[PDB]
Structures are given as C-alpha cells and as structure tokens.
C-alpha cells in the first residue's frame, strides 16, 4: 500500500545508511535488534511471524572495510544477512571501472536483492538512492544501477540524496572527472535530486548547532532527520498528507529542471532552544536564510520556481498560511512571473524524534522546505570551469581510458552541461 | 534669513520604501501579475521541455 | 471597489504598521577557511 | 420516501463528509454506534432521506466513500462518527493520483469508476424517490477534482433529471496550497458548467477570517473548519426533514435562483455567528439575522457584493418566528442598496421557514446568493492559468497521460467566455 | 424610541464620556453587570434613550469606543463599568497617535473610518427613530481632535437632517499639557465650523477655578473634574427621558439657540453646587439657582462672560418647582443686565422645566449660553497659531506627511471670518 | 504591543545596559536566572518553561566585556546569540570603527536584530546606547542605525548617548572624532539625549554625600532617567505620553533634535528619613543651573520645548501651580514663538530602589526632558577644539591609512558650521 524501498550504495550512502536506521528504528517501537518490547512500521519495516522487523533497503558496496562494522557491530542482529552485499576491490575514485569492470559485474546480486525487496511490498511507492556524486561505488555504481532499475521498472519515481563536491571542502582530486560524467546518466533517468554538500553542513553544526569538530556521524544524522520528514506523511495521520509521488508534480515543472534544495529549520541544541519560543512564523522564516542551506547556493541570486513544505508535530493550520502571507509581502524571496501561486503545504500528526544523548534538541513542531531555483546553475558553473581547466591537457583520462572505453564520453560533457546552462538562463528571463 | 527657514523646514529624507496595503477578502493577488508574462510572453525554438517517456 | 455608489475611502499617507521589519536579507560570512571567518570563531592555523 | 445521496472525493471531501455525517446525526439524534438517541419525534418520522433501516434499529448512512489514496479512509473509518459507514462502499486505490487531473480522470482514476458507480446505483435503487447527488470534494486537487467530475459526468448522463449540489472548496485568492492549483482549477470546471446546475463555492481564507474575527478562535483546527461548512450543509436541506409554514426543497432552489443554465454558481452562509463573549449581549431575533446575513463577515467565498450585482438570493429560516417581519427586512434589503441588485429582476430574494431550529440555538438561517462578482474568481484563475499555460510551466505532467494542447485553449476559452456573459448582465 | 447614539475618540474623550455612563446607569438604576435593581418605575420606561436589550432581562449601551492605541482597553474595560459596553462596539489602533493632524485624518484615520461606520450603521439602524449623534472629543490633540472632525464629516453626508452633539474640551489661556494645542484647535474649528449644530466648549482652567473655589475642593482629582462635565452632559437630554410641565428637547435646543447657522458654540454649566459640609443645612428654593446661575465663576470656559453680551440663554431646570417663579426671576436678570444682552432679541433666554433630578438632590439645573465674549478664545487661539506660524516652527511634522501649506493660510483666514461674525452681531 | 529594541555598542554602552538590565528586572518579577517566583511584554519574550528574554543585543569588538557578562550571574538571562563579540578592538578611530573589522560584523548584528524584531508586533522604536568619544560606540553605531535607517524607515531611533565633557576627557582624538560622528545624525537619528561624565560628578558630589564615585553610580543615575523614560509604556497613569510623540512634541526643527536629561530628587538615603518632598519645589529642583546631567549653563540660551515625566503620587492641580510659577520669574526664559512651552506627563509608579545601591526610596520623582539654545556653545567649543588640531593636521594619517580620505574631511567641517547658523537663526526673535 505504502512501502518504499531506499538503495544505500557507496561509502557517504551507508553511512548515511547506518545513521538513519538508528532514526527509522527509534520512531517506532522496533528494538536496535529488531524486536520490540499499529500500522505505521510497514513502509520501512517488514514482519516476520516470530516478531522480527526486516527493513526495506540494501546496503551494497564494493569494499567490505565499511559494511564489515555493521556486520559486527550494533546492527547485525537487524539487517538481512544476504542485504548485505559486500564486493572485492575498490573502484578507486574511477568511474570507468565501477562502472565497466567491477560494477557490471555485482549487479546480478544487487538487482536481485532488489526484486525479493519488491516482491513482499504490494503498494511499491518509489526508489531513494543513497550515495555520492564523487567516487567511484558512488557516482559510477549507483548511476549503472540507476540505468538498470530504469529500463526494468518503467515510470516508478527515482530520487537522489546524494553528497555534491563542495566549492572548497574537497578530499578527492577526481572529483570533477566522476562527477560531471554522472550528470550525462542521471537527468535522463530520474525524477528528483537532493543533493546536500559537506561545508554547509559543517557551518549548519557550527553554528546553528553548536557541536566544535564535527565527525561524519553528525553530518549523516542530520541527514537522516531531513529524509525523516520526506516519508513522514507515507506512514502518519496528518491534516494536509502529501505522499510520495506528489512529490514531483509539485517540485518538478520541466524534465530537466528536477534539481532541488533541501533545508530543515529546527536544527538547533539543547541549551540553545531552551530559552526560545519556536512559533510556526519563525521556523519557516528561517528555512529561507542563505545560512540554512544544506548546499552552498545565494537565493538572493536565484529565483524560486517551486516549494514545498511538510510541518510535523502540533502545527497550527491557521498560522502557516500567515506565515506564508507575510512571506508574499516581503520583496527579499523574489519568483519568476510564471509562477503566481508558488507554495504547497503539507502538516501531519508526529512530532520529530530526537536521538537520547544526541545534539539535537527535543521539539514539536519541524519544517521541512524543498525547492527548486536558478541559483543551482552556479553550482555546475564551478564544475564545468574545473573540467574546461584539467581536461585542456588531458589530466587523468589515462586511468579512464585504461578499464578499454574511449575518451568521447568526455566530449560529450560540454554540450549537454551547456545546455543545461543555457536554458536555466532561459527558463529565469522575465516577460521582457 | 528667511530663505534659511524655509530651509529648516524640509522635512526629511526617507529610505524604506513603504511596504505594500493589502485587502483580505477580495478576488485579488498579493504580488499582482505583470501583465507582459500574461499575453506579451512568446515562446521560445528549444522549448521541447515534454514527457519523458518509458525506456525503448 | 467603485462598482457601484460606495467607494472605499482612501489614507493619504503611508501606515506605520507597514513599515516592518525585512525578512532573510543578509549574507552571514562562512566559518570555514581563511578567506572570510567571522570573528566569533577561534580560526583555525593557516601554515 | 424523498431521498438524497451523498458522495465524496479525496481529502478535503472526506473529511468535510465526516463533520456532515457528524452535524447531521446529531441533529436527528444518532450515536456514533449507530442507533437513535434523539428525544423527540419530528427527528424520526423524516429519517429516511438521509439514512437506511438494519436489523436491530441500526441506522446505516447512505454515502459513497471513494479515494485513489487510502491515507485518509483510516483517518474517518477511526474517527469519532466513523462506525456508522457501510464496509461494502469503502472502495479505494493503491496508488494516488497526487494533485494530477490526468490521473484522477483518465488512466488510473476511470479504472476505479465501474466500482464506485455500481455502489451509487445500488444505493439510488432502494430509495422510492430520488431528488438530489450530494457531492463534496476539492477543486484543485488530484482525485478531488479529477474524479469527481467524471462521477458527476457519468451520474448525469445517466440520470438525467435529477438535481445535483457539489459542495467543493475552491483555490485562495491570497495563499496557494499547490502550484497546479490554476490548471486543476479551471480544467476541471469547464465540465462544471455543462453537467451541473447547483454548486456551491467555499474558499478557505474567508472560513479562516469568520473563525478569527467573528467566532473568535485563537487555534482554529480543520475539524473546527469543516464543522462551518457542514452547518450550511445540513441547513440548506432543512424543509425536507422538517414542516414548517413556507416550504422549499432542493428542486424549488433552482427556478427560483437560476435564470441561465451556465450562471448557477453560488455563495453559501450561515447567519447566527457571533463569538461566547457576545452570546449574551445580543438578542437573537429576525432584524440580527438578516442584517448578517447580507454581510461580508457571514459568507465562505471571498468575493464581496460590491464586486458584482446579486441576481438571486435564497434564505432558509429555521425556528419558530412570524413571516411578515421577515418578508419586511427582505424589502427594506431590496429598496435600502438597491445599487447591488439587478434591475431587470422585480423580486431578487426567495424565502423559507422551516419549524425545527438546531440543537442549542433557538433560531438559524442559511444564506445562498447568486451574483456577478463570481466572475472576479474565474478572472483570476484564467489569469493565473493564462500565465502558467504559455512557458509550459507543468504540461509535463499532463501531456504524457493523454492529454492535447488544444484542451487547455477549449477551457481557457470556456472560461473567458463565462466572464464575458457574467459581465453582459 | 427616540434614540441617540454615542461616540467616544480619544484617551481625554474616553475618560471624560467613561464617567459619563456611571451617572445614567445609576439614575436609571442599572447594576454594573446591566441588571436592573432600581425601586421606581418611571427611570424604566423611557431606557430605549441611551440603552440597548438583551435576553434575560440585560442592558447594554449603544456606544462606539474609538481609540488609535489599545493602551486604554486595558483601563476602561477594568474601571467601575467596564463590563457593560459590548466587545463587538470596540474600536482600536495599532501604531500610536502621535499627537498630530495626520495620523487622524489622513494617513492612520482615513484607515480607520471604514470600520467605524460599520458599527455606526450596526448601531443607528437597529434603533426606532433617531434623533442624533453623541461625541466626545478634545481640541488640543491628534485622535480627539483630528479622527473624530473627521468622523463628524463621515456621519454628516450620510445624514443630512439629524443634529451632531460634540462635546469639546479647549486648551486653556494658562495651562497646557501640550505643544501643538493652537494647530490642533485651529485644523479642528476651521471644519468644526460648518458640520455640528452645537459644540459645547469647555475649559480646564475654568472648571478648575470652579473646583477650588466654589464646592472647595483642595485636591481636585481628574473624575470629580468628568463628574462636574458629566452633570451638565446628562442635564441637557433630561427632556428626552422623564417628563416635565415644560417639555424641551434636543432639536428644540437647536432651533431656539442659534439665530445664524455659524454661531453654535455654546458655554455649559450647572447650577446647585456647594461644599461637603454644607449639603443638609437647608432646602434650596428656585431664588438661589438664578444667582449661581448668571455669575461668571460658575462658567465652564475660561472666557469672561462679562466681556460680551449673551445671545441665546438656557435653563433645563429639573425639579418640583412652580412656573411663575421660573419667568418672573428670568424676566428680572434681564430687567438687571440690559447690557448683557442684546437689543435685537426680544426674549433672550428659554426656560425648560422638567421634573425627575439627579440622585442626592431634590432639586437641580443646567445652564446653556451662547455669548460673544467666547470671541476672546478664538482670538487667543489664533494669536497662538500665528506666533507658530510666521516662523513655521512645527510646519516641519505636518508637511511631511501629506499636509500642505496653505490650508493653514485658509484655516486662519476661517478662524479670521468666524471672529468677525461673531463680533459683527455685537 | 508597546516593544523597544535596545542595542549597546562599545564598552560605554554595554556597561550601562549592565545596569539597567538589573533594574528592569527588579521593576519586574524576574530573578536573574530569568524564571518567575502581565506588562512585563515590552522588555520580555516568553518560553514554555517559562524563562524572559531581553530584547536587547550586546556587540562590541572586544570581548572583554561580553565575556565577564557572561561569566557573571546574567548566563542565565540572556542567550549566547545577543552577546557577540569581535577578534580586534576598534583601537580608538572613526575610520576603523566601521569600515574594516566593523563593516563586516553587522551583516550579524542586523540578522539578529531582524530576529528580535520578528518576534513583536508592536516594535515603535530602537534604543540604541553608545558614546561620542570612542571608535566603536561613534563609528560602528553611526554606520549600524545608518543602515537601520534604510532597513526600517520612519521607525524612530532614541540613542543615549554621552558627550565629551568641557574640560575633562580620556581620549585625545575625542573632539576630532566626535564631529566626524553628528555626519550621520542629523538624518538618521531623531532624538539622542546628551547626558556627559562631569555635571554627573558635580551632582553626586552637591546632592549626594557620596566619595569616590565609581562609573556604576553614573551608570545608575542614567539608567534611571532611561527607565523613566518608558514608565508610561510600562504602566497606568492620568497623562499616557509614548515614544511616538516624543519624536513630535520635543523636536521643532528636524536638525535641533538634542536635547537635555535632567532627574530631580537625588537626595541621599542617609538625608531620607527626615524631609519629605512636595511637588512645588521638585519642579524647581529640575530648572536649577547646577542640577543637570550636561556642563552647559541654561542662561546661555532660552529654552525651546520642555517635557517633564512626574512618576508617583503627583495630582495634575499643582503642577499646574508649578509651571504657572515656573512661567513668572525671568532666569528661566523660552522663546518667542512657543507660547505654551510645556509638556506634562504624569505616572503612578514611584521609582524603584536598588539593593546595596546610592538612591531612596522617595515617593514623587520628575524626569526633566528639554531642548535649549544654550548647547551651541557645547558645539562651538568642540569646533574650535577640532580646528585648532586641524590647523597643523595633527592626527590626520591615523585615519587616511585605514579608508578613509582628505576629500571626506573637505565636505565635514563646514556642517557643523552651518549647525551653529542653524542655532543662532533660530534663537532670535521676530
Ligand atoms: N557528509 C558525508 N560525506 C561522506 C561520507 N562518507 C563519504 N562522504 C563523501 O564521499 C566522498 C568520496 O566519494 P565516495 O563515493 O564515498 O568514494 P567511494 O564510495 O569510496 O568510491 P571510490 O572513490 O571509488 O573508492 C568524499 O568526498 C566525502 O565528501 C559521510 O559519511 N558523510
Ligand atoms: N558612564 C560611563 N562612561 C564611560 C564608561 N566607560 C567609558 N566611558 C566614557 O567613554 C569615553 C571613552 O570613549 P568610548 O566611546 O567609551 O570608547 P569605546 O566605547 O571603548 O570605543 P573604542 O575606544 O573604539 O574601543 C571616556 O571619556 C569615558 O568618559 C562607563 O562605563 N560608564
Ligand atoms: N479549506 C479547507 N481545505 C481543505 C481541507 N482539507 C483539504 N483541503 C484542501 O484540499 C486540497 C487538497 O485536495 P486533495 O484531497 O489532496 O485532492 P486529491 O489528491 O485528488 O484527493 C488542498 O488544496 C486544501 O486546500 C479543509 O478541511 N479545509
Ligand atoms: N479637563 C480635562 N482635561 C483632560 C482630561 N484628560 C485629558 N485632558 C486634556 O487633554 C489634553 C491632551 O489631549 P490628548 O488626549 O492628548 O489628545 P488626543 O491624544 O489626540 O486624544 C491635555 O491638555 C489635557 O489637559 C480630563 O479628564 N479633564
Ligand atoms: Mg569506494
Ligand atoms: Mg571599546
């Protein structure tokens, strides 16, 4: 009725994973070892007549240096024994290779773990893919799967929470190389893409929170807690429910334009929200700051095209739309003239849960604001400037052509990243 | 000296633009369409933004 | 609206309670790097 | 004996169909178990209209329970009135439309019609006479809007006499809740105006505005919202539960209030709206009712009189009170602001009084008018359609469930000409 | 059945009409919460004057509360009679008056004045028939001032024939409380002029000088001050609700009062006034009324009435008197002061004899006097104005806010004709 | 529905906020935790637990002061977010104070200001507490309301400032910097009271039996007039005066908006439980040459628009008395063209006293509020103080070197000689 599948893949994807289960586990009732000391466990949770809970995802990666802690660490006891694909060697920061070599080859387990997933959930909503624009398990194995679950599947949504190249914040030097050439494969085969970097975040858990050296646990909860709220509605009673694949006909207006933002406003401490009133006109203001963002983009150079907002816990309906009122009155967030209505609202029955122990602070009420913009077509600027200055001589297209395929790909980076250039600009020009 | 009273009064100089009286329950818009995107917009040669169908 | 004989009448001048306070306007410099830190960070070593 | 039968589509019609099988249990005094606790007998002898028998004394409701998204049949089958429902009509989908027309109307919403007109037929069979189709539903949704019009469009050319009432909630003027709100929104009407002879619009900020300047409720809730609309609801249907001294059913609401077979949009109300802490500084008499009744404060459509020029008006009165004061306010209405009603028409107003006033209050009445100030809405709904349609904003969506570029230019057309014969007369 | 309906604009409107409605509810014996609990019958039957109906036996006043700040809800709605109006009547602001023109009559007023003719229009066509509007106000401030001159013009076009009652408080020749009195009275009286039928103009300073020396008081605290405006406020429709041997209403103390349509400024005042210890001494007879009645020291304006000669002369007496002593003492204090009174006007002065007076007294009055010397105010007014005007010392506060210069010029030049007018017919 | 947002910049102004944060909350009910033992809502937010939040921010560039605040018993109170510091200190310049380290750091006081202001419906005005002397309470606050000007509009701006007193100072670049200060006053601020360090040191030194005085006892007796300010804000009274007025009944002439603070009975505690004052001589006790908080004498020019705030149990018959005797005598003179002169304001609250502190407890207490002529002169001296450093350029390349130019100095001199005319045409008579 209400099942969805989510595919973790890569490194940041399983991490990410291994983050989230802890928030999927803690919402319900279900124990970190799969029992329990109600219909609403079913579209992330399946049950086993001896009380055991299997979740609905995969966990596929071709190095077993991280899926090995979760096979014998705190979570072994949950996740399905064959869910928990392992591979040999590493596909090295290489597209080529996790995507032509070693990549083809492991599918033939992944797409197959993916069919008995399917096969047990009646009411199939969608795919979140879970992983990393810029390795190789990441950006080259996730994009072959995407491909494949594509021509498989048909018109089933497909959706992207994937880690984008910071404009500074960089551990690889091949990120431009796997990164851009992923784009070739995503937009033809996808309906939505979250996509979040590391430096905002960092300033996000700096400063709004204020935890000082950041691990990556942080960072993959408070991504856990964002795509909590994007299946809130799947499983709890609201007001204004919005399921998944209302999703898209309210983000998406054209096929190529389905890059949006993400943003959650009540991330703040413990002894921060303490002394604060967290009333609904202040939480959905603050999801339009530049310094909320979970990518580093300036709205004020961009112009928004569509929203969404998904309220949780003890919302009011009455101030939300005067919250939105004053927000319509304000020059300071600018539309695009063929866009005269602009927001959609959804308010359900659930307050946000909070790790024990965790950072975060105990609230009723989030917000969850996604949106498309034109100040997205600056982050592709960057990378293409990074490709037009390292493929000028020929870098590292020795290490891409070595796994037997030619260089065209390459070539064909620059026409379609103009292209998609090209008509943001298009798509933003006023009535002139 | 006279000319120096007039001078003392002028007002003043502002500097917010006044923000904008709107009327609740009636049929109107908070920002007002900028009747050129309403039938002064043409389309453009490249707009084959359609459905992207099923694979073949 | 003067579709009729009534009319609304019509303040000459701006109303205080308009004049409110702008919304999310302003660029808060990053806390990351060297390039611009806010002074409420201690920075870390540049080498 | 003379019945109607009620439908509903989607979110905001189920849960507006639930405060209406609320309201109007209580006032034929009906537990949520299911049998009579009413303590009175002019509450029993006309039960029938909106209810069926049972073995037992069981009063089951005649209603039609239709959504392609099952979310909110949990939500009214586990609420407080939800075990009077029959389990046979609860027909449902597995997957929702989603705020797209085309999946509520064609590819995935007509393949669940053959099940839902069966349980309609059934119910229209065992009933001696029909009269009306009640239906609630939103505007601009996805299976709201999307297969509701094809229910009525199937139900009309198959019934083709009977009288039918939407009781739908259109888009805000001031806030949006979707972005496809204009394409839903005049798509879907175009097939309002050549199937249907009484719908009722409801906006939603107007019902925001009476809870907050009128009743004075600092957290006004949706279940405090959808009881609003449920009072006009059960109000309009008054004298055919109840006798009274001038009687008029559903039927003799239609010659009296629609001159044209396309101008039959109409606005709803309820007089007797005042706050508790003004309860008991008012008196409730004649004069108060029908001076609020012909405010802006008492209406669910954004639209003011001043816009436009009422043609029709209609006004149930229920209680026990005289005619002749009645009579006497609705001519000093007439002749004070005769600028705002039209003058080819002598007498402009249509009134009713039944003889059982609702539970607590001692008096009620119920407002419906009929004026070309509607024609501001659809001004602005083609505005806004004309301005999404012409970039190509969100045909994505539409185009590739067979859909043609022609049909939004035929209702665009619909529309503007709608205007132009609102603004004619 | 002959209604009339009240207004209140302003904080020094507010208090001084708030008080207003103690001394009518206990002289028609009306409990705080609105029950009745009175001993006599006769107080009831003329209650549809002033008042309202509920169910269960309940009254509650007509009455419009207008206010630019809820700075006074908070005290009024908390004072001794706070529960008896109607929370649906009430009428607020939210930004602050600021003591000027404009924020009353152009940019924050003109806001206000649609939403203030609705309940205007809830209250004046709920009645039987109605005789008027009711206003209290001052001359020297922003919201009294300005709003409410300008509530008089929105009333006025929509009812031609019926009579405006305002009711002024005018800055005093010695005592100010505040720095922009001269340009809020002249911006007032320049349209004051020509839209009520009778303005009341009332002093501080005079009724001040009242207060300490006539019923001597030492510590004279601003609701003795609204109780002594009050006495006069309700003395002058005490026509309208109790009978009386010589019955005189509102519209009869219209007609007789001005021989010209610009000459309807008029001086109150109260007779039977006496100290604390001195109440149980002796009965009052109707020869001691006429001399507290036609003194100086019992005017409620500052100006003189000496300084001129009286026009138009008042009397609501109300008590069980007889009526030849009630002509013959008015026929001798115009036998006395030849000089005060014009030559022009045979009878200068009406008589009005009711019968029901105030709770505490047996017997009571009310003096109403249109007289030339109040051309002494204006004057005085005007020589305030221009000593700000011929170096435009607050010009700066109005002309940026949509005032313009020369309007100033014309409502000089108005207060100019209105002195001349009124020195004319001496 | 009656807020005011209060900002302190530099170290003169956060040390006075220290102070009036503390009599706020003894005016009110509020430990300084902040929790509780309904007109509190001017100065305080609420929480669900049921903590008050100051309305007011505390920036500075040196962290000094900020951080022993927060070390100190107010943590608790205040949230980490209104206290911002700064890396490096203004270092005594205009030119610093807001163009390299203080040009960037209000891109976060504004955001936290527009966080405060969203949070009320009923903002009128902003309190914004700085110096004339330094760098960062004369630049960084010049260029911030500068900004607040085309941020909110005609909302209205009350700075308490203080001025260099006539013949003592601390800084040496003080008359220098001071007029470089008024260049963005006399079109972005509406009323900044002058309140200087001498005539305070005098007023302790007469009517008070005080020895070695300490800034915490100036700080007090600012504080005071401040929260006198606002009582009718806060409280009921017979004459309810706002800030919105404030701006129209005390200012004539947009440029002559600086007027004086005066409080009267500052009667020490050991000479309290013997006289009892009256009303008669407490007006009086406000127009005396050696009673006010600024060392200008008054005879020096004749009055304008005064504003007198009684709090307590004053009854409006004798200040009638005390205005009408306050008219009679000819030392106290106004000006031709403002015939009514006065303004009364009238309270129910008597001031509150504070705990191991210098006041009494008295029962009447007027805060005397006016604007004179005689502050030309006040003006005059720091111009010819200027012009006599200038004349040999003396600390010029102390501030060229940081952004700012000659240029800027060749349209600075001239306006507050035309401040001077200013004055001077408007105190003759016609
Ligand atoms: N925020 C966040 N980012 C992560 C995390 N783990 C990995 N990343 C990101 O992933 C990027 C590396 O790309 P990956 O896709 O993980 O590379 P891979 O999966 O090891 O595949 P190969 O590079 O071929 O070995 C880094 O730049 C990180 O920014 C995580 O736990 N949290
Ligand atoms: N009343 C009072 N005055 C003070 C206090 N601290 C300093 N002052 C005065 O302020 C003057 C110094 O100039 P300021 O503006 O305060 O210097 P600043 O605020 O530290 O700014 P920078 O020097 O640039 O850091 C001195 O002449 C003192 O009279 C104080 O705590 N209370
Ligand atoms: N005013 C009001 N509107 C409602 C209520 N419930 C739902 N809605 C409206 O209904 C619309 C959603 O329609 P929906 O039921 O989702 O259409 P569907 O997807 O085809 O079933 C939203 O635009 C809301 O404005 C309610 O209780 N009051
Ligand atoms: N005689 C008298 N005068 C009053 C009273 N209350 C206020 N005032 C006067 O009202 C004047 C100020 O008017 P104000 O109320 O500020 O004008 P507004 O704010 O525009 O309504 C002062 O000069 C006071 O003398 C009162 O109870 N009695
Ligand atoms: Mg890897
Ligand atoms: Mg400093």
């Known amino acids: 009725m209400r099942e969805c599948i989510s595919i973790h893949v890569g490194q940041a994807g399983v991490q990410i994973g291994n983050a989230c289960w802890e928030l999927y586990c803690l919402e319900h009732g279900i124990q970190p070892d799969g029992q329990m000391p109600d219909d609403s466990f079913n579209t992330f949770f399946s049950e086993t007549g001896a009380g055991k809970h299997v979740p609905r995802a995969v966990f596929v990666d071709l190095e077993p240096t991280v899926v090995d802690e979760v096979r014998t660490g705190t979570y072994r006891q949950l996740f399905h024994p064959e869910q928990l694909i392992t591979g040999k060697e590493d596909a090295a920061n290489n597209y080529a290779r996790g995507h032509y070599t070693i990549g083809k080859e492991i599918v033939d387990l992944v797409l197959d773990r993916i069919r008995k997933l399917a096969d047990l959930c009646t009411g199939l909503q969608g795919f979140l893919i879970f992983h990393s624009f810029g390795g190789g398990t990441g950006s080259g194995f996730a994009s072959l799967l995407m491909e494949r679950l594509s021509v498989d599947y048909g018109k089933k949504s497909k959706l992207e929470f994937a880690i984008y190249p910071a404009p500074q914040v960089s551990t690889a030097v091949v990120e431009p190389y796997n990164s851009i050439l992923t784009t070739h494969t995503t937009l033809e085969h996808s309906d939505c893409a979250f996509m979040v970097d590391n430096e905002a975040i960092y300033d996000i858990c700096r400063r709004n929170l204020d935890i000082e050296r950041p691990t990556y646990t942080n960072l993959n909860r408070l991504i856990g807690q964002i795509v909590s709220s994007i299946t809130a509605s799947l499983r709890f009673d609201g007001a204004l429910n919005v399921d998944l694949t209302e999703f898209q006909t309210n983000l998406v207006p054209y096929p190529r334009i389905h890059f949006p933002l993400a943003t959650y406003a009540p991330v703040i401490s413990a002894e921060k929200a303490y002394h604060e009133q967290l009333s609904v006109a202040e939480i959905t203001n603050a999801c339009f700051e530049p310094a909320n963002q979970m990518v580093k983009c300036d709205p004020r150079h961009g112009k928004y095209m569509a929203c969404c907002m998904l309220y949780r816990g003890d919302v009011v309906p009455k101030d939300v739309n005067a919250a939105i009122a004053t927000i319509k009155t304000k020059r300071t967030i600018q539309f695009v003239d063929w866009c005269p209505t602009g927001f959609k609202v959804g308010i359900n029955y659930q307050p946000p849960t909070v790790v024990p122990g965790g950072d975060l602070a105990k609230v009723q009420r989030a917000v969850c604001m996604l949106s498309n913009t034109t100040a997205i077509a600056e982050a592709w600027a960057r990378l293409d400037h990074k490709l037009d200055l390292m493929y000028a001589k020929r870098a590292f297209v020795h290490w891409y052509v070595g796994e037997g395929m030619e260089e065209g790909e390459f070539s064909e980076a620059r026409e379609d990243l103009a292209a998609l250039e090209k008509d943001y600009e298009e798509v933003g020009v006023d009535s002139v | ?56 | 609206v003067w579709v009729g004989t009534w009319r609304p009448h019509r303040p000459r001048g701006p109303i205080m309670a308009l004049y409110s306070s702008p919304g999310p306007k302003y660029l808060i410099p990053p806390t990351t790097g060297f390039v611009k830190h806010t002074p409420t960070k201690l920075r870390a070593p540049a080498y | 004996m003379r019945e109607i039968v009620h439908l509903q589509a989607g979110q905001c019609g189920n849960q507006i169909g639930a405060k209406f099988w609320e309201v109007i249990s209580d006032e034929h005094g009906i537990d949520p178990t299911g049998t009579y606790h009413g303590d009175s007998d002019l509450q029993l002898e006309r039960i029938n209209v909106y209810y069926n028998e049972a073995t037992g004394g069981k009063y089951v409701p005649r209603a039609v329970l239709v959504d392609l998204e099952p979310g909110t049949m949990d939500s009214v089958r586990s609420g407080p009135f939800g075990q009077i429902f029959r389990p046979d009509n609860f027909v449902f989908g597995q997957s929702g439309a989603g705020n797209n027309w085309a999946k509520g109307h064609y590819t995935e919403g007509a393949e669940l019609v053959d099940s839902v007109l069966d349980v309609v037929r059934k119910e229209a069979e065992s009933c001696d006479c029909l009269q009306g189709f009640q239906l609630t539903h939103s505007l601009g949704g996805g299976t709201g809007s999307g297969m509701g019009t094809l229910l009525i469009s199937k139900i009309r050319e198959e019934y083709p006499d009977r009288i039918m009432n939407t009781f739908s909630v259109v888009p805000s003027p001031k806030v949006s809740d979707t972005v496809v709100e204009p394409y839903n929104a005049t798509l879907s009407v175009h097939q309002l105006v050549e199937n249907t002879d009484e719908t009722y619009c409801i906006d939603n900020e107007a019902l925001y505005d009476i809870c907050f300047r009128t009743l004075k409720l600092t957290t006004p809730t949706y279940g405090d919202l959808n009881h609003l609309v449920s009072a006009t609801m059960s109000g309009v249907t008054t004298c055919l539960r109840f006798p009274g001294q001038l009687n008029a059913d559903l039927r003799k609401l239609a010659v009296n209030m629609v001159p044209f077979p396309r101008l039959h949009f109409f606005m709803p109300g309820f007089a007797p709206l005042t706050s508790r802490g003004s309860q008991q500084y008012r008196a409730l008499t004649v004069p108060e009712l029908t001076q609020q009744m012909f405010d802006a404060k008492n209406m669910m459509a954004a639209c003011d009189p001043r816009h436009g020029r009422y043609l029709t008006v209609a006004a149930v009165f229920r209680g026990r009170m005289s005619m002749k004061e009645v009579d006497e306010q609705m001519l000093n209405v007439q002749n004070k602001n005769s600028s705002y009603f039209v003058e080819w028409i002598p007498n402009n107003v249509k009134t009713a009084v039944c003889d059982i006033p609702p539970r607590g209050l001692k008096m009620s009445a119920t407002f419906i008018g009929n004026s070309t100030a509607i024609q501001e809405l659809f001004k602005r709904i083609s505005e806004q359609f004309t301005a999404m349609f012409r970039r190509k904003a969100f045909l994505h969506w539409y185009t590739g469930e067979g859909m043609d570029e022609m049909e939004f230019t035929e209702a665009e057309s619909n529309m503007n000409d709608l205007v132009s014969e609102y603004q004619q007369y």
């Open chain 2, 1 to 56: 000296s006279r000319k120096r009273i007039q001078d003392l009064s002028r007002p003043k100089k502002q500097w917010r633009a006044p923000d904008r009286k709107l009327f609740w329950g009636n049929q109107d818009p908070i920002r007002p369409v900028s009747r050129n995107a309403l039938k002064a917009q043409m389309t453009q040669r490249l707009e084959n933004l359609a459905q992207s169908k099923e694979v073949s």
